[PDB]
Amino acid sequence: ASVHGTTYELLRRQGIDTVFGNPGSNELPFLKDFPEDFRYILALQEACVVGIADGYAQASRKPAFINLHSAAGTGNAMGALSNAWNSHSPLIVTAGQQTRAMIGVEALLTNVDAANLPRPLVKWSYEPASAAEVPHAMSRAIHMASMAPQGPVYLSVPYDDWDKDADPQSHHLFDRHVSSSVRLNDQDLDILVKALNSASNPAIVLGPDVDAANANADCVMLAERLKAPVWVAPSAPRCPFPTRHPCFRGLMPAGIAAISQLLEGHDVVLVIGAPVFRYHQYDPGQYLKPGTRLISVTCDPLEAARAPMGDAIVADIGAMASALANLVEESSRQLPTAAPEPAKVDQDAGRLHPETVFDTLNDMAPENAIYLNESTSTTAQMWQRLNMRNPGSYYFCAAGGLGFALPAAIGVQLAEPERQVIAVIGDGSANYSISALWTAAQYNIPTIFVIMNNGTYGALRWFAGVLEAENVPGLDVPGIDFRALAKGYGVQALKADNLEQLKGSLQEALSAKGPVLIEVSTVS
Amino acid sequence: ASVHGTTYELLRRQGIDTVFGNPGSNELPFLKDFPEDFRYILALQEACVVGIADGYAQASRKPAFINLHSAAGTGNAMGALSNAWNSHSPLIVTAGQQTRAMIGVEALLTNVDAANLPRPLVKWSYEPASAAEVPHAMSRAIHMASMAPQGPVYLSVPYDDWDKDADPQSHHLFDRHVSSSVRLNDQDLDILVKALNSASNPAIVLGPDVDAANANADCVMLAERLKAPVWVAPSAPRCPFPTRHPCFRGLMPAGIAAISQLLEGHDVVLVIGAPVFRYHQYDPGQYLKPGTRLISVTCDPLEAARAPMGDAIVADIGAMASALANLVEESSRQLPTAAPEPAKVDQDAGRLHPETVFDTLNDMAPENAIYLNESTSTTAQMWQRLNMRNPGSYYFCAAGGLGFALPAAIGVQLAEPERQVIAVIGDGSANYSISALWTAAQYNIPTIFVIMNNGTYGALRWFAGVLEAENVPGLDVPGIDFRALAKGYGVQALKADNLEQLKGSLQEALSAKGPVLIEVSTVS
Amino acid sequence: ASVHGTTYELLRRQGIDTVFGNPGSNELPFLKDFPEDFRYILALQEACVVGIADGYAQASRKPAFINLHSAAGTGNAMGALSNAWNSHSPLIVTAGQQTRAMIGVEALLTNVDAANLPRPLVKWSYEPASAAEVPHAMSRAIHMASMAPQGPVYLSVPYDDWDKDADPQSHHLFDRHVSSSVRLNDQDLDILVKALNSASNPAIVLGPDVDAANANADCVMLAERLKAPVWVAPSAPRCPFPTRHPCFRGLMPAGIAAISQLLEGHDVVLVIGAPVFRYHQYDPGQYLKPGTRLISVTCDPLEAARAPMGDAIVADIGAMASALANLVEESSRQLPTAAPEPAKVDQDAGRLHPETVFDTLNDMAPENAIYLNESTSTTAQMWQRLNMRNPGSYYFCAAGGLGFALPAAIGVQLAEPERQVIAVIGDGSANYSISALWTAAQYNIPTIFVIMNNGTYGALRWFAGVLEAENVPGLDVPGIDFRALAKGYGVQALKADNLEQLKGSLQEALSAKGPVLIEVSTVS
Ligand SMILES: COP(=O)(O)[C@@](O)(c1ccccc1)c1sc(CCOP(=O)(O)OP(=O)(O)O)c(C)[n+]1Cc1cnc(C)nc1N
Ligand SMILES: COP(=O)(O)[C@@](O)(c1ccccc1)c1sc(CCOP(=O)(O)OP(=O)(O)O)c(C)[n+]1Cc1cnc(C)nc1N
Ligand SMILES: COP(=O)(O)[C@@](O)(c1ccccc1)c1sc(CCOP(=O)(O)OP(=O)(O)O)c(C)[n+]1Cc1cnc(C)nc1N
């Protein structure tokens, strides 16, 4: 067998059947004789390739496979890799290298010092020392991406390797099963359970690894048994809990003082599947107030190490959430009362308040819709106004890197063909990965894109306001016609200048057979 | 509080009470006002500092704390760090940096690009962005070293940081408990146990992480229940099993073909706490023969990823070995028969055969002796001839880096004051870290050093023989007087030119109140 | 031809005929059939290998070639590489890698992420993608080490590469001539010369790259023409000027304030072949005082970039010093007056003052002696008391990394067989690379080693004194018998407890036919 044949066999035996890519000459020997059981998803720029693959992996809860062109293709994807690192996305990033005979002279398209290029944004990064090693290196990449804590990995392959003879002993790679589905030992788990049972006023904080593990239902059971309020950890990349469940208390503000104040009076705070904590704004104060102790369950040693407070347990989130939910006592305390419905913001017949947009989406979207958020100034309102009952219903750029939601919404929609994906994206954010629209059109992936157009980088205006910063350049983005951009890439386009038009546009979009972009005129 | 006071409080609260070091000016502000409850162990070169700390950590089964001088001190220790990486040794390596005001100009003793210096031999490597961050960074270092898979970490600290005010919120660091004591979920553990119960001819292979976890006794129970032969994985850094137990089958040869042949006919091979596998020599063949399947339990994702065959489970070795030992059925198969005693090699009244030396050590040493091996050509014979009943009885340079055993034997002896340490070290190997002898003399750490003097790099002569390599330079090391070297560093010195003298020297050494070096004239 | 044959041909055609090494199995296929026209110099530990090669390269003013064993051998040498980086030493460091077929599994002796290991201490670091690339990669290593600014480089070679067929087109590598012998363009050089001619009170500061370039005599001419005082830049790795020439003003103190004070009143300060500046102690103040402007000629862009003051020209030191010396006007100002002779320190019949030792060395050593300094507390006195008339007469660890002078003195003596090398090394410093003594004995390289024994890390006691630091551990090194250490490694050993014995010992050492170590009892 060839390295080509052996590698594709390894991929299929490990459950991989799709290649997300933007092709180049170093990759042609890999892509030739493309197997008939595989699918190739083209995107026009590598931030888009990786964003699509990322959405697909996060929603499918399985690794996604990417093929990029040498250093320039890899480089174009590095902002996207920053998000993937923070979301623990299992991405296998491969990049084609020059033929081994031309690496020394640094021919055009040589990826120099290749394994160093994507660092520090990957778990593992490698170029094999010989062609016959390629299948083994691919095996390493698959498992490194897939083991807890999941994350992106990088493999560089000289293009002449594919046609070489594979090692017959590579067959041992095909069916390897590698598990990190582990939980705390019985003795120490019993200690933890007793601490939860004994708490007088417990609180629960959940992060994105809960949703990645599909541990949501177990966390609901856990919260119900403990009669505990549930918050989502700050800067949330995913939604780990039904947002209208009586225990739900919403998204935590991303500040040190804000969080310790919120947790004041809670004697035991159990954090599951989150860093402690993904703060954002400067908000100095106490990490925790006197009387509060924190216990973190995390899949990631790097998270456990850097928490400034609390105890930690490094284990699989699925296994731990299931064990805790099934072991804790039913508390005799009263179940928390549901948060009241949000207020309706006054809305005239002109430009849309973001609150109006979210209320209308909530009214009209199916109960199993999936939302993506890259409308950076409206996140708090979005979290309050969308009833998200089901797992896998929310995605937000985990490293704050713009250019995620537009392509990721396409990957999510590909992963979940029966759940309507609705990406709510600011006019600024929409540009970073605008060319991803083409992939939705070409493959008829029926994502709905809602562009919140207020003509400015709104979140930056706000942060500048709090800093009291005068004379900041580059904050306005006037003069972008999003309907024309959509037309450019073959996506049906609608405009909503007021509420009547918003409802009409959403009705049309929800009824459409392909992707649709709606440009919404929102208040400055 | 100062950063100095806060950092020492964090260290003591996390169980650290000893600093292994070689001092410099960048470290003086850390070492001043050295706490009265701490101990400082000086060594004369940094390979020795780290080797001593490494032996101490491995034997104590807890992190060891190291303080080195900037780039040159760190650099001198990098061979030692290569071993520590392979043995999963929890080492907290700190190095002093220039004052922040002088880093930019690259004053003498500036550690340039400091965090990159020890890579790729550390789990985590960092320089804090401010003085107040130092305690938090130290906390990260402690936990990164200590979490499975354990390993060395690196922290660079500008010398002006120590006198600065600490953040009062650093108190939250002091008592953090971080656990990675995890095992496979119940459902999948039951599947594994059933596979072991159902095996017709199981075999067990154990690596160094078994001994690190003190999982030895649990592995004995497991082997007895399964009635299974037990091998030690190749290139063994530690001894994970009583070497005269009936199930014991010895050290595996470090070759692909050799190992698959050894495992032929075994239907299920369970590997615990080892890489799969630390091969050494070129010995191409089948990874496993038809009819053998392999299951690996490893604490290290990097090991699970790179295994060329078998299934893997990434979990704590202590927790997994205990669970398996207590869950498996008692097989009705006959218990394996003990290996017969080794043959006595013919020995005249002249120079000593290594076999004679090991037989004599076995005869005379206490039953709870601890051995170290850096006699590279005699390893197979050592493993056959020393009855090692207890855990923590054997150490060998885990990355093959010479200069480990001499200093490590001092650290081990410090960790285990009631167990006689005997380091068996070749004449070539003895030189790499010769100055470590001084630390044994100064602190009166009563390690026995047995120098196997055959005048040559024996293992290299052998590898050259198999390669059929003629005219290789640099293989001989004549003209070293090890008694004079011992005298140089204040260690009592004896010479054994024959068996009568060997017995006499060992009797004197075992009766001595301090460290002793015995130079043994061994056969070429 | 084989890769082996082609690589040795490239080496010899590029002027390399010596391999400094400590061998291992990954290197045996390189070292086998060792060419009869090459020499191999064995040392017992890799810090010693690299130190010897470094002294050899610095004294010979040509690249030195090193062969180390994988990661552990490379790691043991990294402190030595820190010095080599700072001295711009042209060192070609090669290390053997596992066979390509065993790299993936990370067999014992695999150098993982090899090219990253020696960073940031090398100019270039690489592992070739194929065997046939090895000669080209070696060519790159030779030229990268040799081009200004010279420095160490690293090449990792899988051991199976050597026996493979070379590319016949590799012959084009053999005779490549690569020059960086460049100087400032005529127009701008004329501007510089006019600025020097017009200066009313110029000063000259010289660094190690002057001595490396053998630009010393040209700098003498330059200083004589400009009638300018000449200082050596601080933390001096080499001596760039005759120390009894009337213009000579000695070693600059390594402090910001000290240097600006020294330069006060000098209108133009010309720095040649030094960083601006290698400060050491904290000594805050003005970089330059009003009225002083600085112009730096440096071979190293990294030096030019980081200078906090002055203009800079990046060019070859030899070419620039020659051009300036031959272009400047003869000033009509009076030639500076020679510094007066140092005072004789009162000396009783007991332990030796360092000043006495240096005076006696100056009295007895030949006029073409070469000194090395690793007696860290006595440097200022050494510089004042040794008349060094000739180039290449002084070496001091350029990064402050101890363990340099003992091995480097052996390499220097090998490079300069007709110039008596005398290494003056503190009792603390002597231990770092003590095993290097063996190489001097084995090859009968007649270096004289003068051990300044005061029982303590003297420089650290002084820095602790100025910091007012109490209770610092690890500052004393009692109980080392240096005569016994010398005997251990086969070097003739003498002791000097007083002046009478010092003179007697030096007379014997200077008359000896081999290496000699003198242990001198110096004042605490
Ligand atoms: C033979 O094509 P290659 O050697 O692969 C290619 O790299 C290249 C680069 C420079 C000169 C000629 C070809 C080019 S050329 C190429 C096609 C560009 O199509 P375009 O329609 O612009 O022009 P044309 O080829 O039809 O005239 C692609 C996608 N690539 C790979 C590639 C992918 N993603 C990124 C960021 N950079 C890249 N270079
Ligand atoms: C066949 O020998 P190798 O595979 O090359 C070797 O690496 C090794 C390592 C572990 C087990 C067996 C051999 C060893 S063994 C070896 C000889 C040691 O001589 P010694 O006199 O100590 O014992 P013996 O061989 O005579 O019994 C050397 C120099 N090397 C290479 C080496 C050089 N410098 C440093 C820092 N570490 C190293 N390992
Ligand atoms: C004030 O001392 P420092 O600034 O710390 C020091 O780095 C130094 C370097 C160059 C010139 C002056 C001092 C030196 S000087 C010093 C003492 C050496 O003692 P030695 O007995 O050799 O001479 P002396 O000081 O008594 O005359 C030490 C241990 N250090 C730190 C150090 C530790 N380990 C290694 C590999 N390299 C180092 N430089």
Ligand SMILES: [Ca+2]
């Ligand atoms: Ca906007």
Ligand SMILES: [Ca+2]
């Ligand atoms: Ca030997």
Ligand SMILES: [Ca+2]
């Ligand atoms: Ca001293």
